[PDB]
Amino acid sequence: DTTPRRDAEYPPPELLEALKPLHDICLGKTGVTEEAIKKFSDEEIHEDEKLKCYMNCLFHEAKVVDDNGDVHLEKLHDSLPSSMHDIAMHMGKRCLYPEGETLCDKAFWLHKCWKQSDPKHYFLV
Ligand SMILES: CC(=O)CCC=C(C)C
């Protein structure tokens, strides 16, 4: 079952809420559209270069990157609500080592990898 779970409990409302202002900042900086974000979240993987940098911006704004701006997966896992701890771990267990030239490339690589592993529970806002 690969259909996206979207209800009052999941994605966690408190997480969506905390991310919203970061979304406003990162959408403003990169010029990505809302539609591009929703389509990646809920339908099919697609390559939009501004979406990739939006994704990178979100990791930075969320303070889950190391000193070189790379995603620090332990910090990301700790920043998630406890209720999604196990799902996120299985979703990321074969996505440990991102490939790509730029920080935007590696951020896209991760998101794509998480979405392929568990498209029901994967989301982007
Ligand atoms: C937080 C997430 O989505 C992936 C984390 C992956 C680990 C801890 C192996």
Distance 27 CA to ligand 1 centre (A): 24
Q: Are 109 and 100 in contact (CB under 8 A)?
A: yes
- Protein residue with least CA distance to atom 8, ligand 1: 89
Q: What's the reported resolution, in angstroms, to a tenth?
A: 2.2
Distance 19 CA to ligand 1 centre (A): 18
- Sign of torsion, CA 49 39 61 26? positive
- Protein residue with least CA distance to atom 1, ligand 1: 77
Experimental approach was X-ray
| 2 CB neighbour count, 10 Å cutoff | 9
User: CA 110, 114, 115 angle in degrees (round to 5)?
Assistant: 115
User: CA 55, 98, 87 angle in degrees (round to 5)?
Assistant: 75
Q: How far apart are CA 43 and CA 47, in angstroms?
A: 13
State whether the beta carbon of 89 lies less than 6 angstroms from ligand 1. Answer: yes
CATH number for the domain formed by residue range(s) 12-118: 1.10.238.20
Distance 39 CA to ligand 1 centre (A): 23
How far does the chain reach from its first CA to its final CA, in angstroms? 22
Q: How far apart are CA 2 and CA 119, in angstroms?
A: 5
